[PDB]
Amino acid sequence: PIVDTGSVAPLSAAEKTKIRSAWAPVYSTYETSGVDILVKFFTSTPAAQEFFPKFKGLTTADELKKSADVRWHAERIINAVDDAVASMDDTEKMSMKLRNLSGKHAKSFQVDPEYFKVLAAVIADTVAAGDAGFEKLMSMICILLRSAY
Amino acid sequence: PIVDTGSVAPLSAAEKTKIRSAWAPVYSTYETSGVDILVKFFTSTPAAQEFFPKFKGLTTADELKKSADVRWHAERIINAVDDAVASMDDTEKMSMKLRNLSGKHAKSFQVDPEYFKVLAAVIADTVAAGDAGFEKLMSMICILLRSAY
Ligand code: HEM
Ligand code: HEM
């Protein structure tokens, strides 16, 4: 499954190709996919809801999907993942960008780090459920998002 | 008209109210509005086109509107304006955020500063053409976007 500690083996050329292929369709309509992913996560994980101050009041999927706040947040998250996919060949660049992001989550947003892998799980499930390559990528992302904690 | 140098008088309580009212509808569907605004600007201002490297190839509105790159850029711009609107009562916060943005445009993106007021004009025209209050807000934004040049 998706891990958020330790280390994972590098991505093989074959895994990268599989990932790019599976990701493309999802990213094409990122504003729709991203919202579905965030909404699904938010609704099925009550404990995490307190970390989204701007969502106070919204409870049903309909309320959420109509909120510009929800859409903007979802679009930013989905695009951060997109940047990681585009940087799979440049692991150094991928790290820098995510380390910076980790700092924001730890110092400014103050979000509980345990939820990174939960949302990542939803993303993986939507893009290519069961694919070990994508799970590896998600794990890399989660490990880096926790680096500043 | 919109200016990008000097200084403009503070926004009066009345002007802020007018702005919030006119902005709300537009922001509700920011991903559509934003794209229309960016596309309109891009197509009617050939000189500026060279500053959008990722748009090379796209020439017609249809090609542009279908590009995820165009959509993402448009969504980021429209939201930067939204942040300014939401910070009208905290001029200090508005400045910090825009000064940071100015730096990116000057050091990393290398865009010609003369085009800020041209795009701002399109935004104003769409939201509330003729409103002096909105023009004042747009001028404040443009002046701050040029601060790092
Ligand atoms: C693995 C998925 C994750 C990625 C890739 C990610 C990415 C992002 C990005 C790119 C931003 C925008 C930061 C900015 O505007 O400078 C952000 C903001 C934020 N993220 Fe994360 N995030 C992730 C998971 C989470 C989780 C699980 C939570 C909640 C427990 C969370 C809560 C937040 C909050 C509260 C903000 C600030 C939103 C705002 O105030 O506008 N993120 N995240
Ligand atoms: C008054 C309107 C303007 C605002 C509020 C604005 C806002 C933004 C924002 C928020 C970003 C995202 C930066 C990031 O991701 O960190 C951005 C990127 C950018 N802006 Fe500006 N901008 C404005 C006008 C312009 C103009 C007129 C040009 C072109 C001559 C321009 C060219 C760019 C470019 C090239 C990028 C980088 C896009 C990329 O590589 O992804 N912007 N702008």
UniProtKB/Swiss-Prot annotation, chains A, B:
<dbReference type="Pfam" id="PF00042">
    <property type="entry name" value="Globin"/>
</dbReference>
<keyword id="KW-0479">Metal-binding</keyword>
<keyword id="KW-0561">Oxygen transport</keyword>
<dbReference type="InterPro" id="IPR013314">
    <property type="entry name" value="Globin_lamprey/hagfish"/>
</dbReference>
<keyword id="KW-0408">Iron</keyword>
<feature type="binding site" description="distal binding residue">
    <location>
        <position position="73"/>
    </location>
    <ligand>
        <name>heme b</name>
    </ligand>
</feature>
<dbReference type="GO" id="GO:0005506">
    <property type="term" value="F:iron ion binding"/>
</dbReference>
<dbReference type="InterPro" id="IPR012292">
    <property type="entry name" value="Globin/Proto"/>
</dbReference>
<dbReference type="GO" id="GO:0016491">
    <property type="term" value="F:oxidoreductase activity"/>
</dbReference>
<dbReference type="InterPro" id="IPR000971">
    <property type="entry name" value="Globin"/>
</dbReference>
<feature type="domain" description="Globin">
    <location>
        <begin position="10"/>
        <end position="149"/>
    </location>
</feature>
<dbReference type="GO" id="GO:0019825">
    <property type="term" value="F:oxygen binding"/>
</dbReference>
<feature type="binding site" description="proximal binding residue">
    <location>
        <position position="105"/>
    </location>
    <ligand>
        <name>heme b</name>
    </ligand>
</feature>
<keyword id="KW-0349">Heme</keyword>
<comment type="subunit">
    <text>Monomer at high oxygen tension and high pH and dimeric at low oxygen tension and lower pH.</text>
</comment>
<dbReference type="GO" id="GO:0020037">
    <property type="term" value="F:heme binding"/>
</dbReference>
<comment type="similarity">
    <text>Belongs to the globin family.</text>
</comment>
<dbReference type="InterPro" id="IPR009050">
    <property type="entry name" value="Globin-like_sf"/>
</dbReference>
<keyword id="KW-0813">Transport</keyword>
<protein>
    <recommendedName>
        <fullName>Globin-5</fullName>
    </recommendedName>
</protein>
<dbReference type="GO" id="GO:0005344">
    <property type="term" value="F:oxygen carrier activity"/>
</dbReference>
